[PDB]
Design a protein around this nucleic acid. Structure first.
Ligand SMILES: *P([O])(=O)O[C][C]1O[C](N2[C]=NC3=C([N])N=[C]N=C32)[C]2O[B@]3(O[C]12)O[C]([C][N])C1=C(Br)[C]=[C]C(O[C][C][C]N([C])[C]C2=[C][C]=[C][C]=[C]2)=C13
Length: 816
RNA sequence: GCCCGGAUGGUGGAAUCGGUAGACACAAGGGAUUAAAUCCCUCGGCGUUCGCGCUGUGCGGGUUCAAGUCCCGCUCCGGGUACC
């Protein structure tokens, strides 16, 4: 009783309900099956899904459904990165609280994800704003504090705000070195992490300052140039600069100008530091290019060999000394710029003649012996600031006794619950505004608990591991369950997370490994960064000179003979400027609502277009015509199955009794199976895999369907096609598999395997070239020798008119 | 300015660690059909006797029998970034 028309509104919600009733995608830690952990970055509950979520999650679902078909035990989890700033403002504007707003958004977006047919294990679903989740990061933060990895300090955000830090710098070498294990991670992401880590090898040099109580220590990556140091430079916010700023209004003004935010700017402090090797006095200047946060907040200036110092000394008349020769051993030309390149020393006394590595070592060694030097490794990577002065976050489990002592919240008081029934005044966090909230009792003593909450990247740093044991009440992780599934096989997300989430979850993994929780070094094997979804963008210039962005749907376009947009207007008469394909946005007004598209064409059409239009890691250009083309293709697949099943049951296929035509058509079915298998599994080229299925569908629509063996071959092809399309379009394929009388549910059906005997080509095509230009195309047996292929090539008349040989492919003959 | 990318028909894209350039789809133009929609052929440019011939992967070069693919440049494009 198959329907003639393909109507997704009659197929999809029934097929989705079936997946919920049968718990089809719910998995456990089954040791008899090879596991596969396919993860996609968890969504933030903003209210509605965007095309970027649809692309990310379709990619993940294609892999999870295919890996299942190969007989693997697949974990495809989903959850909600539910804490965050956008709930705080939306609660105020909508006269509600961040919690019911978030839970309403989770419920609406969850329905949207189900309407897309993503095969998630919904029993492992998590909301990171529930105490059942954040209680484990609170307990883990108390353990890190006891391990010496957590400290508090006032840092600059400009306001100096006291913050909680986790020492990520204690793991920097490992984060850096373990990038060489990440062969299935993109080079871009790895480069961004190497650069963001910024490992640096140098020397700390300490100086004595005349009429100043403390010493002054600088950090240098070029100690070889120490004899060409003519002055020192400190940050504006540096202690020495602030001491001198009292008897200096010129310096006091500069420090304030710096605080109230590539040109150089500086004021001489008036302090004189003594060069440890010459005993000479050099001035100490306050500089704008020196960061207080990096190293010691002070540098040694060698204007002759550092370009920042060159421009600083040239502007302020400071001394520029040459101490490094140019590559050819000649003295450098410092009249226009600094000599940056590393080389042999001169004007360096006992250090003359030493090459770069020898000069670096000898000067570092000499100073180290004198007590005024020591090698130091610094990192651009700053410690992880994890606290926020915001309400909608997980409470920090730290307390301050009346004693003045600071300690973690005791285990028997965990979790520190964030109250959800609150009224937001927009100005202050309800847990800060109510003075009684922070008043607690710890170790029998009155205490004030932390009112700052964790930043949301704390919950996203370990969610991937919590999906392995989401209802485990005895700890953060069940090591047995975690190690069964971890590391993640493929993590699908965006490159925009390279140096934030993609680095924090690597660090968090190692902390868990070092706590005994996991037995692996890295959280994810392969990282697949999907590209942005693009849409056309138009704007008109208003009478006031303002740009008003118009949605492409609202643009009436005029095209040339070659279909390119030549002129465009809107229904109001405004002349539109087409800007091309760009990132979807609210500023550009060109966003496409995936819910509008799923209701218009069905989830399978939307799913298939996004996998077909472009390679997963490249940008996708949203085109209405391309989505309609995908819709038409699914209707052609439906039509071929409708007509085939309308002819009743089929006979058993006999490969031994096949016609020359019937065998060649079967060979194309099996060669397609092999290509689609390699494109989805090994290459991850879903577009070429869908193209191969479309090419085969074109052939099947031309094949005869009258005759026992024609109908039996068509049965083998339609059962294979429906299974190959299933990861992309699971709802239509679930239904078509039932119409074709396939065994069980297509979700539990095996992935089609190519019959090696069906793909034995008895002959091959040899392109015959003479001087590289193709002149002939011949057909020779696959078992033929080179002599047989050359004799047959010579027999061709056009070849005869006019020696490299590739078996079964090419034969080129250079003209002599 | 720096870093890392990228450049193939009218468009998205294919050609998988050199060997038939443009698969597959969209757009367009013919065909069936009483406008839309769907189905069926044609389709890089130029020339053509309509058979095809010549050329063609941003621009120059190099290795090679052979380069879209590998290497060095120049131009244009894109994302990221801020004296560490
Ligand atoms: P990092 O490690 O990288 O760096 C270091 C350096 O820098 C400086 N500093 C220090 N500290 C500081 C702060 N705080 N801020 C700012 N800055 C700073 C110093 O300087 B040096 O080293 C160090 O020393 C010397 C004298 N000035 C020198 C020279 Br003679 C030369 C050079 C230098 O430095 C530079 C480096 C930077 N960068 C890395 C560069 C580059 C970039 C890109 C490309 C290439 C290169 C110095």
């Amino acid at each position: 009783h198959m329907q003639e028309q393909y109507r997704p509104e009659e197929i999809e919600s029934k097929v989705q309900l079936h997946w919920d009733e049968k718990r089809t995608f719910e998995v456990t830690e089954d040791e008899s099956k090879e596991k596969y952990y396919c993860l996609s970055m968890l969504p933030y509950p903003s209210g509605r899904l965007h095309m970027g979520h649809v692309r990310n999650y379709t990619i993940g679902d294609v892999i999870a459904r295919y890996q299942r078909m190969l007989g693997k035990n697949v974990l495809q989890p989903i959850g909600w990165d539910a804490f965050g700033l956008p709930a705080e403002g939306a609660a105020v504007k909508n006269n509600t609280a961040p919690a019911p707003w978030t839970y309403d958004n989770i419920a609406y977006m969850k329905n949207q994800l189900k309407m897309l047919g993503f095969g998630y294990d919904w029993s492992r679903e998590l909301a990171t704003c529930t105490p059942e989740y954040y209680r484990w990061e609170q307990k883990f933060f108390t353990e890190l504090y006891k391990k010496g990895l957590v400290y508090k300090k006032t840092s600059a955000v400009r306001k100096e705000i006291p913050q909680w830090f986790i020492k990520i710098t204690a793991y920097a070498d490992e984060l850096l070195n373990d990038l060489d294990k990440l062969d299935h991670w993109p080079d871009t992401v790895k480069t961004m992490q190497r650069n963001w880590i910024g490992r640096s090898e140098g020397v700390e040099i300490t100086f004595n300052v005349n009429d100043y109580d403390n010493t002054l220590t600088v950090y240098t990556t070029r100690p070889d140039t120490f004899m060409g140091c003519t002055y020192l430079a400190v940050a504006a916010g540096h202690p020495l600069a602030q001491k001198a700023a009292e008897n200096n209004p010129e310096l006091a003004a500069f420090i304030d100008e710096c605080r109230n935010t590539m040109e150089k700017k500086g004021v001489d402090t008036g302090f004189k530091a003594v060069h440890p090797l010459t005993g000479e006095e050099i001035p100490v200047w306050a500089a704008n290019f020196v960061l207080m946060e990096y190293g010691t907040g002070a540098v040694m200036a060698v204007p002759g060999h550092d370009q920042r110092d060159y421009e600083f000394a040239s502007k302020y008349g400071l001394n520029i000394k040459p101490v490094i020769l140019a590559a050819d051993g000649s003295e450098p030309d410092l009249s226009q710029q600094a000599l940056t390149e590393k080389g042999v020393l001169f004007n360096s006394g006992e250090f003359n003649g030493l090459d770069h590595e020898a000069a670096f070592n000898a000067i570092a060694d000499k100073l180290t012996a004198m007590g005024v030097g020591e090698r130091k490794v610094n990192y651009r990577l700053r410690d992880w600031g994890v606290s926020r002065q915001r309400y909608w976050g997980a409470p920090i489990p730290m307390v301050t006794l009346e004693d003045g002592t600071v300690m973690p919240t005791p285990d028997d008081q965990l979790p520190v619950i964030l109250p959800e029934d609150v009224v937001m005044d927009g100005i202050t966090s309800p847990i800060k505004a109510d003075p009684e909230w922070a008043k607690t009792t710890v170790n029998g003593m009155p205490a004030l608990r932390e009112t700052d909450t964790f930043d949301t990247f704390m919950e996203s740093s370990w969610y991937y591991a919590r999906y392995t044991c989401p209802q485990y009440k005895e700890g953060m992780l069940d090591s047995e369950a975690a190690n069964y599934w971890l590391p993640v096989d493929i993590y699908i997300g965006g490159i925009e997370h390279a140096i934030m989430h993609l680095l924090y979850f690597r660090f968090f993994h190692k902390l868990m490994r070092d706590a005994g929780m996991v037995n692996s070094d890295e959280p994810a094997k392969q990282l697949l960064c999907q590209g942005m979804v693009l849409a056309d963008a138009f704007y008109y210039v208003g009478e006031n000179g303002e740009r008003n962005w118009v949605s492409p749907v609202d643009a009436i376009v005029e095209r040339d003979e070659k279909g390119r947009i030549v002129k465009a207007k809107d229904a109001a008469g405004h002349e539109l400027v087409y800007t091309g394909m760009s990132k979807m946005s609210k500023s550009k007004n060109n966003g496409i609502d995936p819910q509008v598209m799923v209701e218009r064409y069905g989830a399978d059409t939307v799913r298939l277009f996004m996998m077909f239009a472009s390679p997963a890691d490249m940008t996708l250009e949203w085109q209405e015509s391309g989505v309609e083309g995908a819709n038409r293709f699914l209707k052609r697949v439906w039509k071929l199955v409708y007509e085939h099943t309308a002819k009743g049951d089929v006979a058993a296929l006999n490969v031994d009794a096949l016609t020359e035509n019937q065998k060649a058509l079967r060979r194309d079915v099996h060669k397609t199976i092999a290509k689609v298998t390699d494109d989805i599994g090994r290459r991850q080229t879903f577009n070429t895999a869908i193209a191969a299925i479309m090419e085969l569908m074109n052939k099947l629509a031309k094949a005869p369907t009258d005759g026992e063996q024609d109908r039996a071959l068509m049965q083998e092809a339609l059962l294979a096609v429906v299974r190959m399309l299933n990861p992309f379009t699971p709802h239509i394929c679930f239904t078509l598999w039932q119409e074709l009388k396939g065994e069980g549910d297509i979700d539990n059906a095996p992935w089609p395997v190519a019959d090696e005997k069906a793909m034995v080509e008895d002959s091959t095509l040899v392109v015959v070239q003479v001087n590289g230009k193709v002149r002939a195309k011949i057909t020779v047996p696959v078992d033929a020798t080179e002599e047989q292929v050359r004799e047959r090539a010579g027999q061709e008349h056009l070849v005869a008119k006019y020696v490299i040989y590739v078996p079964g492919k090419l034969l080129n003959l250079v003209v002599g």
